[PDB]
Design a protein around this ligand. Sequence first.
Ligand SMILES: [Zn+2]
Ligand SMILES: [Zn+2]
Ligand SMILES: [Zn+2]
Ligand SMILES: [Zn+2]
Ligand SMILES: [Zn+2]
Ligand SMILES: [Zn+2]
Ligand SMILES: [Zn+2]
Ligand SMILES: [Zn+2]
Length: 721
Amino acid sequence: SRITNYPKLEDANKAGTKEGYKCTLVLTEGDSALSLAVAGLAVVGRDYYGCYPLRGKMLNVREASADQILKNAEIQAIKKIMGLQHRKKYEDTKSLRYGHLMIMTDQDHDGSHIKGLIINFLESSFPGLLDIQGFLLEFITPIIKVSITKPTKNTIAFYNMPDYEKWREEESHKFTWKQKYYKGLGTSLAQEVREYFSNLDRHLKIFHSLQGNDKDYIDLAFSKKKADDRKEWLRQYEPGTVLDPTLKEIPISDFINKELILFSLADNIRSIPNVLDGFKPGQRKVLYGCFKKNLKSELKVAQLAPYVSECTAYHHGEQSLAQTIIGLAQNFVGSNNIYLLLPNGAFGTRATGGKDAAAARYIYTELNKLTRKIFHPADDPLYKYIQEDEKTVEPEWYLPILPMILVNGAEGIGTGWSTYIPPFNPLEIIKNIRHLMNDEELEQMHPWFRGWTGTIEEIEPLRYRMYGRIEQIGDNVLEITELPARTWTSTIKEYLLLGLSGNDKIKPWIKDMEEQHDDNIKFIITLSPEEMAKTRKIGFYERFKLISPISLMNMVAFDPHGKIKKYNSVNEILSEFYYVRLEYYQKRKDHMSERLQWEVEKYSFQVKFIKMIIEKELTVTNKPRNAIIQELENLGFPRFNKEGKPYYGSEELYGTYEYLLGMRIWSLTKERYQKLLKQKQEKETELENLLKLSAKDIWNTDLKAFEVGYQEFLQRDAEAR
DNA sequence: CCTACTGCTAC
DNA sequence: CGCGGTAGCAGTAGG
Ligand SMILES: [Zn+2]
Ligand SMILES: [Zn+2]
Ligand SMILES: [Zn+2]
Ligand SMILES: [Zn+2]
Ligand SMILES: [Zn+2]
Ligand SMILES: [Zn+2]
Ligand SMILES: [Zn+2]
Ligand SMILES: [Zn+2]
């Protein structure tokens, strides 16, 4: 008997047949994975192998209504292809279309989450299913394919971050090599795939049947009731703890604690921002790229996203990066207090919360002139730029002149941990910064939204109410001129439209409604004298959904040391930022002076070089460079490397005399020599002025420069709305 | 009273 | 030119 319902299904020839227990079903992650699976069929035969693609992250069958599960075509597709049912407890795979189930995921963190979801799905749906030894299978592929180029040619395959990281630190320096990041399951070429299958028993591992504490760890990972537990489960995790590679048998208990947990950690990392710059890895990459390129002139989002992705080693779909770019630009009421990128297009409106934005290919963006005032360029050389893909990418964090996290706030959903942080008035933030500066007591801050005209009151510490505005403009006629921030027009629109035409369960309570929105909100509502009184008893704000709460009881973020932390007060966040920022201001000056001193040396020896040649004391014309090099050292000339660091001792380590002989012949002309002297003089002056400033003098300098730019920003923003 | 939903980066 | 599904957490409003 054959299946019909599912076309993409490459059903094994002997599936469901007397050899069902022998057949294996390969569940792929995506069609990129599927392509590989069907390509492997040409090697292992269709008789005992079949494959079916999983569309997306799988449904979590825990805490799901039988209706939701039944509605999920994906889950139903598997039950039908495997010939699976609930009743009783599985004893043998004899009653099934297939006798084995193999999981083919990218082998990335999200791929691990897919596996866990499948496992969770099998363990939950089908009692005794995972009891059967050798039922669940896992196909694995390499994470990093290293290629040794110059020294002794051999390719290495690492199946996890740690293995490759222990090599990268303890072996890599000994070779000239290149690392390719093997994501997809859809890119791998066939020349090295036909080998994957010729010897698959090593690319094949088997999940050990359920043992003690296996079911408990699954529940710990996928039980919608154990959020708090995971938090600790992540705290307990010890770096370096990782599954043995090539072992060929996996206990489920330590597949979760050694592989899946890796995803959870990465999940939080990307979903929850850092306290210092209020950025998530994605956002931080975008700005880094925008810094790398000169984004003073606009380019379309569909082009920026791939660009940023390429130069920051972004390992995830570009689509996810493009949306991030959109989110960073969006300038409607209820979105960023300060948008670091300009919405040069239909970047979405307040109506649907930016969801009505145009495709990335229609819109354009660029750096807000104020962005570089916030993230000062002089700080760039200070940060620690993450090493990834044998190549430097974005920093661990940026250090804004003011807590940006407080300016814009943040929201995210990871594993075990969650976050919310509302926006705050930058003017208040700078005020408290001046207070921290002046050894003064901080003033308490309340949530603030750019261009918003509603009112906010504090109920309890960490709790606020947010009111819109409803006014009676006529007998039986009300007018809504403002909604609670983050309350989109379409939400109230549908609600009003509901009361106007009534509903199956609720009787109509609205006589008429209109929309007259301009650069503001304007709902003109008409009520019968009967409803007017009824609304007075319920409250006009309460019955029109013009009241929304704001909770500061879940302000979570990574601290300066990369450790996830929950903040109990707004000032605590600002305080932790301040001291880290102050430290980097002194650190900024110390770096600038060092750099400036080097430049001065560079300029001075360049002048001496030209000067001597003009006297005719030194001659470069002819004379083997070997002989010229000796002359220079013997005259006291120091070598310079690409960074700009001098060497007086006698390669990047030592430097070269390229800063002299590398100059254009132009530099010998008097007009160039004069320009050179002016430059040297300007650098000496820069060094003198710098040494006359304290870390706070410099910080205060940036702050006032920001205040001036911020004022213009507020104008341009109010102008464009 | 439990449910369902919203938000957001990723699949 | 566009639509849809899923994870994960905290809290709020709906049936
Ligand atoms: Zn994938
Ligand atoms: Zn992937
Ligand atoms: Zn191999
Ligand atoms: Zn065993
Ligand atoms: Zn990631
Ligand atoms: Zn990487
Ligand atoms: Zn610290
Ligand atoms: Zn969609």
